[PDB]
Amino acid sequence: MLIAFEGIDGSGKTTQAKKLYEYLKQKGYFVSLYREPGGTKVGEVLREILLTEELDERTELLLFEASRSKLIEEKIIPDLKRDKVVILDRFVLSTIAYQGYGKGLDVEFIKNLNEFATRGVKPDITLLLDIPVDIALRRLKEKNRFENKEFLEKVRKGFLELAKEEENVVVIDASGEEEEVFKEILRALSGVLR
Amino acid sequence: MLIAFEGIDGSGKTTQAKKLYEYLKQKGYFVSLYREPGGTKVGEVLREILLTEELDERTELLLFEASRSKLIEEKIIPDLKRDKVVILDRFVLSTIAYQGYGKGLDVEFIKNLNEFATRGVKPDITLLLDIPVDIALRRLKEKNRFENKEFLEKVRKGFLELAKEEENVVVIDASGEEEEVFKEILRALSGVLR
Numbered sequence A, B: 001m002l003i004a005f006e007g008i009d010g011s012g013k014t015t016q017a018k019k020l021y022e023y024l025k026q027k028g029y030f031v032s033l034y035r036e037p038g039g040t041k042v043g044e045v046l047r048e049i050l051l052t053e054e055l056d057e058r059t060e061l062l063l064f065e066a067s068r069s070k071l072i073e074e075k076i077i078p079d080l081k082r083d084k085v086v087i088l089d090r091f092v093l094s095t096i097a098y099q100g101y102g103k104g105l106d107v108e109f110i111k112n113l114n115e116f117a118t119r120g121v122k123p124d125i126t127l128l129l130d131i132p133v134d135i136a137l138r139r140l141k142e143k144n145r146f147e148n149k150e151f152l153e154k155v156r157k158g159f160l161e162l163a164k165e166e167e168n169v170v171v172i173d174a175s176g177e178e179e180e181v182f183k184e185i186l187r188a189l190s191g192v193l194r
């Protein structure tokens, strides 16, 4: 089965995704953890380009999808055939919220591309780690990570609208402490996974 | 002004596009010559991936389009704004013929990606260097290069259908000799540039 972590930078997705991965493996599930973009050899190359080069937003959209395509074909689709629990650090909702809201690209066009790159694979549940931008920015500032407050505020809202509109999204209060946020994720998952 | 060479591998695109580059430059035009994929730094990185790594067809489609977004916004749109003659070695018809007619992906979906990546920029004329696969393959083997007969036959017919179904496309008989082929190209150009 498939579990997506979503939300803005600094909401704790890397942290919780890895905590869920270890937790679920200890309980006997065969589990996978992938990040987006990245997660394959080609995908990580694309990731380094996305994070390093100066790119217009259209080329950006195409490479995020190129990473996703390779991840879906090479690892996700097989993993799910073997009944692995696949954990994603970001998925299709990140693209809509960042490139749609955020960058201003057409939401329906982004969706068509998501569907193309995913072959229509969708999560059993998406965990939206929602957090106020000013709090996420303080968290990132401690590791010397700077992100754009005006940009991330639009993006937070997009995630919230998507959580109302798309299926199987649970809003998590990510401003809590690491153990409380993880307990709230466990309750959210209790609906679909033992 | 925008001039695009299209056609199967080994049809003389590289050769004639450079012939035309030197020709127009001697006659006083400011000219650019770009290849697809490639033509920019990021575009050349993706070209080396597309050529050397084992990719599924969907990831391929997205990378070909990503290289094209980069070339359009970084170079072609500025070039055209300065009234440069831009000569492309492969453009949007190559994606339709290879990824659509060749590998079976949806041509309307491809044409939507084309439009998104080009921002609606279309050539003034496209030169299809039509040639029988057998000849092309022979020329290619002489330079120690081998391509897939069964695949190119589909791609050639795709190019010919687009020459009818698309706009501003002239079919060049590229089986002739180099000066013979360039002579039909100049003829085709004279209804566009002088």
Ligand SMILES: Nc1ncnc2c1ncn2[C@@H]1O[C@H](COP(=O)(O)OP(=O)(O)O)[C@@H](O)[C@H]1O
Pocket (backbone or CB within 6 Å): A008, A009, A010, A011, A012, A013, A014, A015, A016, A139, A140, A143, A174, A175, A176, A177, A178, A179, A181
């Ligand atoms: N619940 C939490 N409370 C406070 N800080 C946290 C919490 N979870 C993670 N962090 C810290 O916040 C920073 C960003 O978290 P990370 O998991 O990398 O977020 P994301 O992957 O969503 O950007 C890291 O330095 C991390 O140690």
Ligand SMILES: Nc1ncnc2c1ncn2[C@@H]1O[C@H](COP(=O)(O)OP(=O)(O)O)[C@@H](O)[C@H]1O
Pocket (backbone or CB within 6 Å): B007, B008, B009, B010, B011, B012, B013, B014, B015, B016, B139, B140, B143, B174, B175, B176, B177, B178, B179, B181
């Ligand atoms: N008119 C021609 N007749 C015979 N051989 C040619 C002709 N034009 C080019 N060639 C040779 O065929 C090979 C492929 O040409 P090239 O322009 O690289 O084709 P493409 O770019 O379409 O792959 C090159 O080695 C070139 O020297």
Ligand SMILES: Cc1cn([C@H]2C[C@H](O)[C@@H](COP(=O)(O)O)O2)c(=O)[nH]c1=O
Pocket (backbone or CB within 6 Å): A009, A036, A037, A064, A090, A091, A094, A095, A096, A098, A099
């Ligand atoms: C997967 C994805 C990530 N991103 C952003 C999110 C991050 O700011 C950045 C790198 O992601 P990360 O910090 O979570 O690893 O790429 C998008 O804008 N669109 C997308 O589709």
Ligand SMILES: Cc1cn([C@H]2C[C@H](O)[C@@H](COP(=O)(O)O)O2)c(=O)[nH]c1=O
Pocket (backbone or CB within 6 Å): B009, B036, B037, B064, B065, B090, B091, B094, B095, B096, B098, B099
């Ligand atoms: C521009 C483009 C090229 N190709 C193929 C054509 C070539 O076989 C291959 C390398 O290009 P080249 O031989 O013309 O240099 O990339 C596609 O499949 N789709 C595309 O959109």
Ligand SMILES: [F-]
Pocket (backbone or CB within 6 Å): A013, A014, A089, A090
């Ligand atoms: F993340």
Ligand SMILES: [F-]
Pocket (backbone or CB within 6 Å): A014, A035, A036, A089
């Ligand atoms: F990450």
Ligand SMILES: [F-]
Pocket (backbone or CB within 6 Å): A014
């Ligand atoms: F991160």
Ligand SMILES: [Mg+2]
Pocket (backbone or CB within 6 Å): A013, A014, A035, A089
């Ligand atoms: Mg991360």
